[PDB]
Design a protein around this nucleic acid. Structure first.
Ligand SMILES: [Mg+2]
Ligand SMILES: [Mg+2]
Ligand SMILES: [Mg+2]
Ligand SMILES: [Mg+2]
Ligand SMILES: [Mg+2]
Ligand SMILES: [Mg+2]
Ligand SMILES: [Mg+2]
Ligand SMILES: [Mg+2]
Ligand SMILES: [Mg+2]
Ligand SMILES: [Mg+2]
Ligand SMILES: [Mg+2]
Ligand SMILES: [Mg+2]
Ligand SMILES: [Mg+2]
Ligand SMILES: [Mg+2]
Ligand SMILES: [Mg+2]
Ligand SMILES: [Mg+2]
Ligand SMILES: [Mg+2]
Ligand SMILES: [Mg+2]
Ligand SMILES: [Mg+2]
Ligand SMILES: [Mg+2]
Ligand SMILES: [Mg+2]
Ligand SMILES: [Mg+2]
Ligand SMILES: [Mg+2]
Ligand SMILES: [Mg+2]
Ligand SMILES: [Mg+2]
Ligand SMILES: [Mg+2]
Ligand SMILES: [Mg+2]
Ligand SMILES: [Mg+2]
Ligand SMILES: [Mg+2]
Ligand SMILES: [Mg+2]
Ligand SMILES: [Mg+2]
Ligand SMILES: [Mg+2]
Ligand SMILES: [Mg+2]
Ligand SMILES: [Mg+2]
Ligand SMILES: [Mg+2]
Ligand SMILES: [Mg+2]
Ligand SMILES: [Mg+2]
Ligand SMILES: [Mg+2]
Ligand SMILES: [Mg+2]
Ligand SMILES: [Mg+2]
Ligand SMILES: [Mg+2]
Ligand SMILES: [Mg+2]
Ligand SMILES: [Mg+2]
Ligand SMILES: [Mg+2]
Ligand SMILES: [Mg+2]
Ligand SMILES: [Mg+2]
Ligand SMILES: [Mg+2]
Ligand SMILES: [Mg+2]
Ligand SMILES: [Mg+2]
Ligand SMILES: [Mg+2]
Ligand SMILES: [Mg+2]
Ligand SMILES: [Mg+2]
Ligand SMILES: [Mg+2]
Ligand SMILES: [Mg+2]
Ligand SMILES: [Mg+2]
Ligand SMILES: [Mg+2]
Ligand SMILES: [Mg+2]
Ligand SMILES: [Mg+2]
Ligand SMILES: [Mg+2]
Ligand SMILES: [Mg+2]
Ligand SMILES: [Mg+2]
Ligand SMILES: [Mg+2]
Ligand SMILES: [Mg+2]
Ligand SMILES: [Mg+2]
Ligand SMILES: [Mg+2]
Ligand SMILES: [Mg+2]
Ligand SMILES: [Mg+2]
Ligand SMILES: [Mg+2]
Ligand SMILES: [Mg+2]
Ligand SMILES: [Mg+2]
Ligand SMILES: [Mg+2]
Ligand SMILES: [Mg+2]
Ligand SMILES: [Mg+2]
Ligand SMILES: [Mg+2]
Ligand SMILES: [Mg+2]
Ligand SMILES: [Mg+2]
Ligand SMILES: [Mg+2]
Ligand SMILES: [Mg+2]
Ligand SMILES: [Mg+2]
Ligand SMILES: [Mg+2]
Ligand SMILES: [Mg+2]
Ligand SMILES: [Mg+2]
Ligand SMILES: [Mg+2]
Ligand SMILES: [Mg+2]
Ligand SMILES: [Mg+2]
Ligand SMILES: [Mg+2]
Ligand SMILES: [Mg+2]
Ligand SMILES: [Mg+2]
Ligand SMILES: [Mg+2]
Ligand SMILES: [Mg+2]
Ligand SMILES: [Mg+2]
Ligand SMILES: [Mg+2]
Ligand SMILES: [Mg+2]
Ligand SMILES: [Mg+2]
Ligand SMILES: [Mg+2]
Ligand SMILES: [Mg+2]
Ligand SMILES: [Mg+2]
Ligand SMILES: [Mg+2]
Ligand SMILES: [Mg+2]
Ligand SMILES: [Mg+2]
Ligand SMILES: [Mg+2]
Ligand SMILES: [Mg+2]
Ligand SMILES: [Mg+2]
Ligand SMILES: [Mg+2]
Ligand SMILES: [Mg+2]
Length: 68
RNA sequence: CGGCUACCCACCCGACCCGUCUUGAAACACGGACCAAGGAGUCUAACACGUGCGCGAGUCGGGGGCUCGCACGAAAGCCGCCGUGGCGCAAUGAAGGUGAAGGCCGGCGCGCUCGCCGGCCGAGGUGGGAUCCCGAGGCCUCUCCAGUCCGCCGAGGGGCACCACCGGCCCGUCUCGCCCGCCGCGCCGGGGAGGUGGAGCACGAGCGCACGUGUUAGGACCCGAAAGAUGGUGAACUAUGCCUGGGCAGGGCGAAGCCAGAGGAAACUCUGGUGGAGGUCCGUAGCGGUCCUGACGUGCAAAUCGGUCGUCCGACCUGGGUAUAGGGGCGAAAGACUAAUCGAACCAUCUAGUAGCUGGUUCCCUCCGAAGUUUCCCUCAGGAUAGCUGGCGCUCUCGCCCACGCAGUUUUAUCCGGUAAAGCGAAUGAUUAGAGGUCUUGGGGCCGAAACGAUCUCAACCUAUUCUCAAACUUUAAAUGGGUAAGAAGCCCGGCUCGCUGGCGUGGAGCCGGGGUGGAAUGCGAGUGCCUAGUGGGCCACUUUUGGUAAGCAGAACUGGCGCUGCGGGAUGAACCGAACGCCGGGUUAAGGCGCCCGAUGCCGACGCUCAUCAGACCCCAGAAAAGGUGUUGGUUGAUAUAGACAGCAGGACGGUGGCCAUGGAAGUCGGAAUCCGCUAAGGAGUGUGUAACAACUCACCUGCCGAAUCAACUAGCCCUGAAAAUGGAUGGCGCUGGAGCGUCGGGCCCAUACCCGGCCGUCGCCGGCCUACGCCGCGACGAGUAGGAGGGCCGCUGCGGUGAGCCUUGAAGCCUAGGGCGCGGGCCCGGGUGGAGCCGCCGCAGGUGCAGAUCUUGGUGGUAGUAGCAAAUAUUCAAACGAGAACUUUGAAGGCCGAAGUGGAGAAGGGUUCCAUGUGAACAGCAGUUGAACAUGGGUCAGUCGGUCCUGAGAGAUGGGCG
RNA sequence: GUACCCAUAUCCGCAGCAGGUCUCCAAGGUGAACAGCCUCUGGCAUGUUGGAACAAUGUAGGUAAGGGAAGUCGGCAAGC
RNA sequence: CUGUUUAAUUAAAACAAAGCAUCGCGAAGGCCCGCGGCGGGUGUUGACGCGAUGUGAUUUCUGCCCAGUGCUCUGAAUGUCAAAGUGAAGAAAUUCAAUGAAGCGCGGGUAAACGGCGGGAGUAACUAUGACUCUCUUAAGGUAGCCAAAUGCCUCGUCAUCUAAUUAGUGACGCGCAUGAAUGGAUGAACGAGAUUCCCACUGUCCCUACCUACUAUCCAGCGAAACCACAGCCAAGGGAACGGGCUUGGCGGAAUCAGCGGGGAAAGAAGACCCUGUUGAGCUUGACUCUAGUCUGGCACGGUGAAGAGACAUGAGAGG
RNA sequence: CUUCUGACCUUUUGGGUUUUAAGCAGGAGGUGUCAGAAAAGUUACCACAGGGAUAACUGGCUUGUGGCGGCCAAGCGUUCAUAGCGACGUCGCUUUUUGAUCCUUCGAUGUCGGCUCUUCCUAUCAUUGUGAAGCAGAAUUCGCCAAGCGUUGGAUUGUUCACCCACUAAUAGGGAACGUGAGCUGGGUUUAGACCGUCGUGAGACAGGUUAGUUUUACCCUACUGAUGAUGUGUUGUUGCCAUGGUAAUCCUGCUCAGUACGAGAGGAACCGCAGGUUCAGACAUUUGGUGUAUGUGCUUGGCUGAGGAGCCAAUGGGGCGAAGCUACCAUCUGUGGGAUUAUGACUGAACGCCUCUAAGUCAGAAUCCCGCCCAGGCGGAACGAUACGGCAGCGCCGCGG
RNA sequence: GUUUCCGUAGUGUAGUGGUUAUCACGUUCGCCUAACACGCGAAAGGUCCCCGGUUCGAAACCGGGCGGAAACACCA
């Protein structure tokens, strides 16, 4: 009652029945898996960007609108 | 006259018998004699998904109650201070428990990696994102002017759903630190910053009903077992006890005991009788069954018969009563017997036990359409998961010098490898041979007391070489192939934040604003979510390969095919070569072919080869080698020849020298080493035959005649030998030789479901119209398919509610039909013939809803087939009679059988009217009857003294008692 | 209770089935014999069919010149 | 030996049998039945009896091993040993310690209990075979007997006889794969429907077949089924699931039949009794796993009275290292 | 599940304290069949659902192995390679052995050997025709055409195989599903009983040995043997042809040849001719031998008809003879010739001045082949006879018209 | 063919839990006897089958050959 053990015949055709897909769409790449010291940099940097960016960027926008 | 058609026949071509296990079925694989009816995915509960409806942060009366008693009312209507309750609106923790809002501005404490006060906004930000909004601009028959008018867009903006990322909040754990409150200042609570686990929040979408698919548990698509348990029934067969009865013809051998005679002193012995002993012998009835492995062997018989058999006074056979009853009995022991069943009986129930295992699974059309593979499992005939597949959608994109994106593809750049090859005078491992050098030791020879005092050779060593290799060697290193980039998600500029980092405003990340899109070729409109069947036994071929001698063997890689697939060639074929399939007409072609089957060369086809007494004839493919040929055809390398060759005919073919090694011989001729001269026209210390040797013959070489082309060795095309197998046989056969063989080709010719054009059906896509909108058109490309999945059916059956002022005894259902027709098909309508009382159409609803199979169930009928068979036991014959009817009934007569252990006369068990008379002969008796045990009617069994009844036998049994 | 069968036709075996089932009576001859054979008392139609012919093969029975087990696994069967 | 047995494939060399043995049991018992009781069988019985086995008449023998597995006897001298009881710690559950019934271990007996019985080397004035000898070795090393046996692979062992010829038979030899002593060994008169060899007579068993008779088979009168059947039946070759009847190419092919025969229809009869799979079973067997009837023990109640003696715990007094 | 570690952790259920128990997080006690059940053997007394997914037969591919050949020739062959042989190497055929695979067969294809019977092959044992030898003759060996005909009787074993005796020309090799079991036999293999030896404690096992062990059916179709038949010539009969199918003859001994050829001998043929014989085939019964139921005749046993006579019964009572007919290699007779040719040997004669059997042509040539002879004669045809009274009839030939 | 075991002075054998050449017989010398047996005192004889690996160190543990020895080879 010996049977056939292992083969890869008729496998690439089944692969190309449905058109093997690149992931092909990653805009704004995922952030997990990155250095926790770098994350302790980046999250505090982002929340202080949210806090203290108003007046200097506002005056710079006024200055570049006056100069351009 | 016309007519397709479920009528019949003939002709040309094609055509193996359906269904399923299988890689493969017409199979010498299995089921099927035929026909009619029945016959197999249902129902409940639960879950998940999709769809339809109602209400909607709610939803639901299924549990009850209320109405007047109603056939439909076992319906329906209502409750609402009947919402108890289920699900959802809140999750996280094992639990104590805890439990989803943040942002902006001003002031205050050292705006201090830091809290408070007052006000405002409010489920955050970024990149895409259908749609929507503002609008430069320009366009309408002659001018200034306007309003709606014809009329879009560059650019900008708010951004649905959803995707991707960042940030925030809640719960349990982890690290670091400080602060706040006191119905009481404590191992009391609460709060902050970070990275983690959650099925969370981040404006909720659920509830109820219905339909469809899938899964689970219930008998669960249908049928199927060896088996297990529970409770009862059998000792009429058989096995063994016990009680009570019956039976066993005749002969042979001659034990004990006894008598008589003789011998002996005694012990005792010898002879002749009598006697009838015995798990004794021949043998019958009886009981069993050795052999013919006889007869039968769909029989007389689910174990019998004919001979030949063993035993037959006994451990013998046998009737009746009784006892032992199923994991029990009983066994002179075979696991044999226990009611045709015994290595665990019979009947019923659990039970429709389970089966990963056989067989079967019921109408049509259309569309799409596999796999025999990864991993896991006590897994290998199975299942789970992933892959392949179908269905349901959603998000977008095109139709008006420029979009987004993708690719079994190429190009331009950039990396990767270690196979094919090649090499080892390059490492590792093997391996061959020669040369040169002289350090070392070992073995021989020489000078000679011995002495690395000296010499030659050998052994090993070194150097330069040289031969052959390595899947588990490699300096080098291909072809093929794999990854990446070819832009608006990109490039540059300016500025903030950082608790990361640090000479530095240093570096790096994030955030904000702005600028210009024409960024390799070709083709294509893309992304994404849910549910799920089947699949998990494969095979073949080119190429690369593993084991084996090889296989139509076993196992791998890429691709294609069969399976899942028709069509044209290969005669026939699963895989080969073309080419893939809706129904047809015309033309053309591939693969192949053009002597006839069998469509096409029947061309005044071309060149050359082949004669085969086994010719040859097209990838797989169905046969053949090493070797050989003065059979023919080319080709290469050579050698001769007028200074007359090859063949032929004729002659010469010596001297030294009978050379030398050899003694049995060599005096050219078995044998080993050699090898020169003279005459020369030429002689080889001799090519062969022969002698034991001596001798003769012939050849190398030379010359006489003839006369100009000849010889040798290789090579490859056809053909031949090599070439032998069993029924008669295969280029397909017939045949074919100036081809119908072989190799090279030219022009025509034939066709497939292949291609092009056109007619028709269907699907899909795009689209038209304010004409059943679920209808009507318009254009274009496509149609094959097992398992499987969907859509449609104005296909069909049964029943229910609406509905047709439906159909009819002037003929409904049903059935038949060489009748007419429709639809592609499921099927349907009408006509004609019997029939006599119910039937149909549309719209919805619910099914015990379609048969070709299952050694399918029931019922009926063929071939066999008027066939086998009416043959165990000696046999019947003549006349008459009743009678329609006599091989069989009855009687007369004759001949036979059974022959007293009967084919006779009566009983027990069992049968129940069969006993007897009369009448009939459709039915019974395997033909027949006037006959019977058949049928119908009527009769028949008389007891104190025959038996039961009475008695106990083996045994069965209730009370007292005990157990339960 | 009293009939009848008590069986190759009244029982059992699916049947008018060469199967099975317990008993008493038993004559003459030959013969040791209740052996086998022929008769008498008593029964019967040959056993669920008849007619014609005598082929193969078969089922039972008997022979065969000479050899006598040489056939066959075995003298199996048959015969002395 | 006579007898019995697989009814329906065996009749025996199988079973039984008398004889020879062994073991248990003196009745509150041996072996058994029963769900139950002091209920039953042996038992209306008592070691010349009952129950359980081995071998199988007579004669002659019963070799040697208790190492192993069984069976039995003995002792609280002695290790282990469960429930119950005793003492201590604590508030208690709980824990600890000693005391220790059977069995096992410790010792002995038993083999007419299951069973077992060795392999090398050197050696004799022809050589071989070998009396004899050294060593390893177990519990004992096959003793008396017998033999290519119904037991011997080599094997058709070697010699002799039987025969023209013998793998057969018989007698003998015996390091005998793997004979052997109640697992009985060796003989043996009588008897085998037991197996085998040879001889005389006898015959169709044959050489070598032939003939006759009875019945059937044949035909006719009457009456008449059954198995089986997708269709239906001419072959050769090719291919195909590798042996076709039907496909292809050939050979060819006239209705309807009867009597035979058995070459085929891979003929029929049965869901292969051989082999393999099933996470399908059933008889069995044991040192498989898990239990249990039965049986042997210990404890608690039924279970009570008197005396003697001992062990352990508690109290105070005295010697004591 | 157990165990240990940690929080001055949570719950121990009406509320507190303590013990205990549970939980939380992570280390350990394992599933070696390693993603993990807790597990001995036999069934020949076996059963069930299945499989040709999977062995034991044949058949199919292959030919290692077995067998049979070839190639170059170191040598054997007194000398000498190839008369006959042939190592070291190498190329093929066959399924008559064995092996390899599992392709068909598991709802069955009956498994060995023997008996009987038919056909085929050649890798030829003999016979016919030939060539070559170390072929003087005889006897052998190697080859070719060649399968037409033969290729035994027996002791042993179940045999396939093998050994032995004797005969002969020779006792050659095989195939047909390892031919043949609805043909047989059942000897062992291969059920159930039983014995011996070994293994296993045991049930049981043993390509170790020995015993007794059911052999089912044809009436269907085709094939084959035999027999009615059928179609066409108008019916029918007689006499004939052969298209086709088969085939039958084979072998040996004795006498002359001749104790001659040949050979020194020992030995020792051949061709023609003549008697026969083995096997086979066809007949036949005059004789001989069987058979016997003319139940023909005649004895005799037991019974029966009263006794003699005449008879009968006993499954044809026994045995002595025996007619007709069947039958025996147990009696007797018969078995027959022409052609083309294979192998081979040649003629003429080139290729190639010569040579040559060949290349075109001619000859001899055999158990091979075909025909003759012998059988049945075709969906084959001939020649000839008679062709329908009766009383009406019916039927042929010629030429007719509708 | 498969799986295990053995090989040591002339013979039978012991022996590593790594670091000997072990016991007896056999040969030879001496004493004892008049002389052989026997006894006593002694000596010689080892490639631990052959070739490699591990370790400082092997015959020893392991790998490959050589020559022997046990068990199986079953179902058809
Ligand atoms: Mg597989
Ligand atoms: Mg299957
Ligand atoms: Mg198959
Ligand atoms: Mg099929
Ligand atoms: Mg079959
Ligand atoms: Mg079939
Ligand atoms: Mg059938
Ligand atoms: Mg129906
Ligand atoms: Mg509520
Ligand atoms: Mg709930
Ligand atoms: Mg069932
Ligand atoms: Mg059970
Ligand atoms: Mg009885
Ligand atoms: Mg009995
Ligand atoms: Mg007697
Ligand atoms: Mg009998
Ligand atoms: Mg018989
Ligand atoms: Mg008798
Ligand atoms: Mg007798
Ligand atoms: Mg007797
Ligand atoms: Mg039971
Ligand atoms: Mg029975
Ligand atoms: Mg059983
Ligand atoms: Mg039972
Ligand atoms: Mg069912
Ligand atoms: Mg698997
Ligand atoms: Mg799809
Ligand atoms: Mg290479
Ligand atoms: Mg499905
Ligand atoms: Mg499968
Ligand atoms: Mg393969
Ligand atoms: Mg295809
Ligand atoms: Mg398939
Ligand atoms: Mg496909
Ligand atoms: Mg074709
Ligand atoms: Mg072909
Ligand atoms: Mg033509
Ligand atoms: Mg083939
Ligand atoms: Mg031909
Ligand atoms: Mg389609
Ligand atoms: Mg139904
Ligand atoms: Mg209904
Ligand atoms: Mg039907
Ligand atoms: Mg069907
Ligand atoms: Mg049926
Ligand atoms: Mg007949
Ligand atoms: Mg009358
Ligand atoms: Mg009479
Ligand atoms: Mg009597
Ligand atoms: Mg009587
Ligand atoms: Mg009557
Ligand atoms: Mg009457
Ligand atoms: Mg009748
Ligand atoms: Mg009546
Ligand atoms: Mg009672
Ligand atoms: Mg009476
Ligand atoms: Mg009767
Ligand atoms: Mg019956
Ligand atoms: Mg008398
Ligand atoms: Mg008398
Ligand atoms: Mg009768
Ligand atoms: Mg005779
Ligand atoms: Mg005679
Ligand atoms: Mg005689
Ligand atoms: Mg014999
Ligand atoms: Mg006899
Ligand atoms: Mg006689
Ligand atoms: Mg018998
Ligand atoms: Mg005795
Ligand atoms: Mg003894
Ligand atoms: Mg206690
Ligand atoms: Mg002891
Ligand atoms: Mg000696
Ligand atoms: Mg002895
Ligand atoms: Mg004999
Ligand atoms: Mg022994
Ligand atoms: Mg025919
Ligand atoms: Mg054929
Ligand atoms: Mg064929
Ligand atoms: Mg064949
Ligand atoms: Mg067929
Ligand atoms: Mg046909
Ligand atoms: Mg066809
Ligand atoms: Mg017939
Ligand atoms: Mg089966
Ligand atoms: Mg399994
Ligand atoms: Mg060979
Ligand atoms: Mg197979
Ligand atoms: Mg059959
Ligand atoms: Mg057959
Ligand atoms: Mg012949
Ligand atoms: Mg055969
Ligand atoms: Mg037999
Ligand atoms: Mg036998
Ligand atoms: Mg047996
Ligand atoms: Mg017998
Ligand atoms: Mg017959
Ligand atoms: Mg002379
Ligand atoms: Mg004759
Ligand atoms: Mg006569
Ligand atoms: Mg008389
Ligand atoms: Mg008289
Ligand atoms: Mg007579
Ligand atoms: Mg006579
Ligand atoms: Mg010639």
């Amino acid at each position: 009652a010996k049977s056939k053990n292992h083969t890869t015949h008729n496998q690439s055709r089944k692969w190309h029945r449905n058109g093997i897909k690149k992931p092909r769409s990653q805009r704004y790449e995922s952030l997990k898996g990155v250095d926790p010291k770098f994350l302790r940099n980046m999250r505090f940097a982002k929340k202080h960007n949210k806090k203290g960016l108003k007046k200097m960027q506002a005056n710079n926008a006024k200055a570049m609108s006056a100069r351009a």
